[PDB]
Design a protein around this nucleic acid. Structure first.
Length: 92
RNA sequence: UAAUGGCGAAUGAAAAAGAAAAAGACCAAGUUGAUA
RNA sequence: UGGAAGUAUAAAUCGAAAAGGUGAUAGUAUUCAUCAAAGUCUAAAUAUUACAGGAAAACUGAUAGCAAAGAAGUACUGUGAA
RNA sequence: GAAUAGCAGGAAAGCUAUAACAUGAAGAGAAAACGAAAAACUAUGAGAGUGUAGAAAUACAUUUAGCAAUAGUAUCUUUCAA
RNA sequence: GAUUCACGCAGUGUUAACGUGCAAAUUACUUGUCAUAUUUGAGUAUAGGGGCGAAAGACUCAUCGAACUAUCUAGUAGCUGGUUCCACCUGAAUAUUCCCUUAGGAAGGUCAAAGUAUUAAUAGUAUUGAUUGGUAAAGAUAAUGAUUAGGUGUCAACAUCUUGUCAAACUAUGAAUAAACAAAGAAGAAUUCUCAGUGUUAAAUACACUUCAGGAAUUUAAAUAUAAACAUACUUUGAAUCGGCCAAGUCUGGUAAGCAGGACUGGCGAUGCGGGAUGAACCGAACGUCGAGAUAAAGUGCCAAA
RNA sequence: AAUCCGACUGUUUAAUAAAAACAUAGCAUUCUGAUAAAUCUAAAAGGUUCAUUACAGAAUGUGAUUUCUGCCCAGUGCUCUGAAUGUCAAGGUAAUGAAAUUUACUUAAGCGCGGGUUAACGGCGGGAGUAACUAUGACUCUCUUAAGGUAGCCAAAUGCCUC
RNA sequence: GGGAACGGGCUUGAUUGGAACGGCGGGGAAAGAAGACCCUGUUGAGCUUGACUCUAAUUUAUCAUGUGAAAU
RNA sequence: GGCGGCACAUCUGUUACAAGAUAACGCAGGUGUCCAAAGAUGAACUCAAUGAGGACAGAAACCUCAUGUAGAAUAUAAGGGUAUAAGUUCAUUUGAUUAUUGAUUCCAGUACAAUCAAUAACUCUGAAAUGAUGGCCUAACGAUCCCUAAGAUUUUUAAUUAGAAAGAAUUUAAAACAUAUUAGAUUUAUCUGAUGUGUGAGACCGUAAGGUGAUUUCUAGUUAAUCCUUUAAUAAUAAGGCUUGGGGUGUCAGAAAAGUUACCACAGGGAUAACUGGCUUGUGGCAGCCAAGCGCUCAUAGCGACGUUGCUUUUUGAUCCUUCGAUGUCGGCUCUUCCUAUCCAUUUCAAGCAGAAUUGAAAAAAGGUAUGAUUGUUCACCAUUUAAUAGGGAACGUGAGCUGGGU
RNA sequence: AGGUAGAUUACCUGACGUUCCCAUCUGUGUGAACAUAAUGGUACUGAUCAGGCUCUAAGCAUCUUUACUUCCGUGUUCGGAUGGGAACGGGUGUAUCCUACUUGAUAUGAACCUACC
RNA sequence: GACCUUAUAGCUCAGUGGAGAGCACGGGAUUUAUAAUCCCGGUGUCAUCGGUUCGAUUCCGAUUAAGGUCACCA
RNA sequence: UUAAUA
RNA sequence: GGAGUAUGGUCACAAGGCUGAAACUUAAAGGAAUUGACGGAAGGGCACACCAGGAGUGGAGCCUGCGGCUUAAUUUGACUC
RNA sequence: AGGGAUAAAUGAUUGGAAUUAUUUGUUUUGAACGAGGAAUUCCUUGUAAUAUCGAGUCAUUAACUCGAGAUGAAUACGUCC
């Protein structure tokens, strides 16, 4: 919901409690060279139409929130998942 | 079996290794031109 | 296609060489290994339920075995394929 | 009775071939890389004797061995993890 | 592209005949129509997701909301029908989980057949002992609610004392029936001596675990009832089944139902026999082939034994 | 003697429907100047209308005559003699990198923007009050649509209530 | 009467002489046909539509090098 | 069946039967969230309400005392829990973290999810014991493949210096050409033969005990690489692996999916509707019991309210037991029979029966109960006639008996 | 006899009055510092002038309450069992289990370690 | 019956987590007088009950009225 | 610009 | 007036044209012209009529007249200039 | 301290009679009223405007009317809106 940046959480790499920078995880750009994409492009080539199912029955309205808690001094990034919230905001 | 496949249902070879039999020869291009 | 960032074929476009191809994860480089495409022929080992001639059988024995053990693809049906 | 190669007999039968391989003897890992003893321990358990007595068979006392099975221990190989 | 009759033709009516017919669409009378958008022969053209159609999905060889014929093809079917000798032994199911599941599957329960173990491996039972629960009942200025009145004190109103009647989604109290233990298995007890490794600890000789670590002696078969050696514990492989139905000193929805759905048990299904005249379930009692007797439910005027 | 439908002559479900159904003449709309329009074919100096040429060819609705065809371009179609820098492909160009790759810029139709069109598909409102007894409401009020069902006609083969 | 709740057969009664001709239309829940109505199949087919995925025809752009020039 | 609804994933109370399990399209409701504080900890305080007082101030503003078992509050539905608190206020804080195990709840003793018990780190709060791995408890959620992020540096190697300890190493037939040096040819991005050494080489010196010596080991600094793979060897890009999260399937153990057939077809079904029959009798029809009253007086000549008890299957419901390899589905026509809850004729009793006409009731079902306009009608409404023109059953009597008007 | 720490958590609570304090405990004086709040009221710290006035503790009462016994009552209900009675509804008989509410009598605490008196 | 929507001045509608518009009505002005015109004012239980509510006319259920759609195969 | 009635 | 209406006849595709009454109702309807009045008709003049301004009234309190209300009576005349 | 209504306790006048205060003094009471909306009135020089005096009515009672003087603006010399 609301969560401030600048957390102080144990960092496994340094084995110590260090300040940590909290952000939100966004899915990266889908690549055209991963194996699953190359296989899908090959299948769609040629006659036969859509060769793979297309999801069309969405029911969920929200998504689980993943924070990217990052070591300030050592760049070790953790990932903490939060429960589904309709409105999420990064506080002060 | 490796692999392929709404990686689902299914599809799917080959070198090695062991036998049968065993066999190699030509054009083109190049050279010789009192040229055939 | 088992061949997965393309194994094989074909089409449209493009198109080499003081050579080059392959080493199946795309790319560049340096080594290594192995071949030398884009013309041709070639016996033997292999297949066979056309058909012909034979020999066998833990096969059938006239509603069985070929549809057909007699003038059987005959009698008979259909415009015709059948 | 892997193909296949020989034998007598004439044989879809029979006999013989130090042999490629299949499954197994070693297991874990995606893979690289690896690859098993404290010559084991504990518990209960199969069997074998001696003595006494009832007195027909059999019923007790005591000595000994402790396999299979189950359970639990150390130890060792592999795995991020047994 | 006027009105009618005739040769012909069609098919309006009888919804006549016939309806295993003369006929796989015909006959009789009636009606209509009977030359120019007329009738008709031969030749010719148009062919299957095609043709042709003054349009009915009509016609395309008795076949048309997609012909006929052959191959794929013995197409697939969770659906329907059938599935072949005798005797003997054992003998079921409708719970639970998941499925595009609901006329069907897989895990699992019930069952059968094979194969084992001397076996810390018996119990749909009762008793004694310590418990658990919140049902039946009970209560109603005992908590939360519901509701009829009567006194006393400061019209009502508010306090306070009684009375009458109630709660599946109220409760102090709380049965009967039940549930889960114990009644002597590191292997049938106890005591004495000696006693080690860790750790707890302030330190321990306390304490905890270690085959009640271990080792040795003496004593000992005891510790509710009943039943149980063709007992007990199973292991492996697998069949069928999960449409159910009835009864009731039971319950829920419904006016009610031979209605619909549940808790516990017993049955029918899978089951014949004696009785209720007859009947899937009721009562007695379950079955190798027979003889003799005593019986059960129930009966003894005749059918009908008494 | 009347009522309904179809104007008429004609055709129709071979074998249960012969009719109000189909055709019809008449009316109306759309496209096309032939190297075209419609349209058959896998392809084709291929084929049909077409031995034709807008008084023609092709595609549709209504169905003689008389009288008349009202309002609506918002929605979906169709169209434009129309706009540019909204969105839009393969490509083309350029840059970095050793290279694949990656990134940026630029590209047509189409959609979007604007207009036209209903004899294109189609559509064409609600409440309340008030006229010297009682009704009815010529009349105002105000919510609202792209337009509010116009001329006509009616318990109609079209009206539940309804005999 | 009971039963699958409408028996020719079973139970209790009523009652019966063997073979039948012409009619007849009550019954044999008479014959004809694996219900055409309804439902269930993860069985179809015709037809419709911005149902999903495609496709012929139509359309637009690029490539496929005829010569000689000018503007951007 | 369709329309409606979700009893499809899911929580609370009750049905529900004092262990566990547990039905209905049974009842009353609930979820797809919300929270940097509403998580953690420490301290202080006590709530709702009532009484009595205080200028404006009153029923309700703010202050004070007293009583006050929670009648307040605790994010939410309901039920549980809570008073030096789990409620209010104040203060610090991020344990709402990383790694590894063992169990309990659904359970097939599978997965997901949830509920706990410990261990190893680093931390928060407190003086401390303790407490802290999200919310006081019961719901608030999700596979394979695919996409997308985080992590694998604690360690192991090679090379090179210093020191130290063991260490023969296998044994004759040879080509690639890195080249030098010559014999020819050539001008181009120049080639073609042969001679040559090394490369590339490996039989250690011992009849003297054995030393030397490649190659390997340990320790101390140095520089380099360091999760695995792309299979001839490396490199920097790329791609694939391993562990853990997110993106989702609500039909919630998870296909990618619009209608209509009256032109319809097939495999089946009484597991399942439209007709009879069967149970029921709400509804319909008929009949009773009591007696507040009406009936000028008079509860009962004739009725009979408020209540209450029955019968019938002639209406429609309710169910789905029989029939889906078929029981021909409305009405009318013709014809027979049966019931009485009797319309007429016969015999009686009663009256608010003077006569006539009537009304209530008993015996009695042997006999009669009609003709037409409209409608397919059953039904109905009209016009007559009659002594009366009553109500019903028989597969809603009766289609190899008719008709085919309706459906 | 009193104080500290408790265990059982009303026989321990609530209301009305009552008795000592000799030690102990409490109330009691004060604000300089630690510390504290709006307020030395609380909490904090320093102290000893006075008092049993309230605490606290012990006792009183036809005391509400609470805790055991009897009775209520073998009355409610219930496990088992008919070809037992009734048109139902419901309720016997048999071999058994057996509440609750009220009411009456009784009680109002017992007990553990340490110090002092 | 089943789903959906609405309910606010005397009449038609607006808008609502702390009630506008119009028409109507009343008073004053202009006019010989009415109508029109100008000026000012008074008008809403937000349909009736419960809960969330800081606080409801708004948010959540209920009871009413008012309409709209469906009520099919036999 | 608008200007109805008795 | 009814009325160029109804009906009948005829002409026209139609609208309509030609011919064309009666019942009933009613003391007036109408023509030219005169005088006045009026005109959001024209022309010529005038007025604090307006213009340029002043003071104001209308808004407050009170005095006073009128309407209304009240009362036994609130006596009455006058209602644009 | 502008404003002097409204109320109070008291002193006298005229009158036959003063309460519903005839008129008036004293002290206290201290209200609207911050230049006034739509509209509308009068005025051209000793005029408007401002404040006062006399007279009519008059036993008592002027904020009324009819007159008189005191100070002395602004604005036009126009036009038919």
């Amino acid at each position: 919901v609301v969560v401030p940046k600048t957390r102080k959480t144990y960092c496994p790499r340094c084995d110590k409690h260090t300040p940590h920078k909290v952000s939100q995880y966004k899915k990266g750009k889908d690549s055209l060279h991963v194996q699953g994409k190359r296989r899908y492009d090959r299948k769609q080539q040629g006659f036969g139409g859509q060769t793979k199912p297309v999801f069309k029955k969405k029911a969920k309205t929200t998504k689980k929130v993943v924070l990217k808690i990052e070591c300030t001094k050592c760049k070790y990034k953790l990932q903490k998942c939060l429960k589904r919230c309709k409105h999420f905001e990064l506080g002060n």
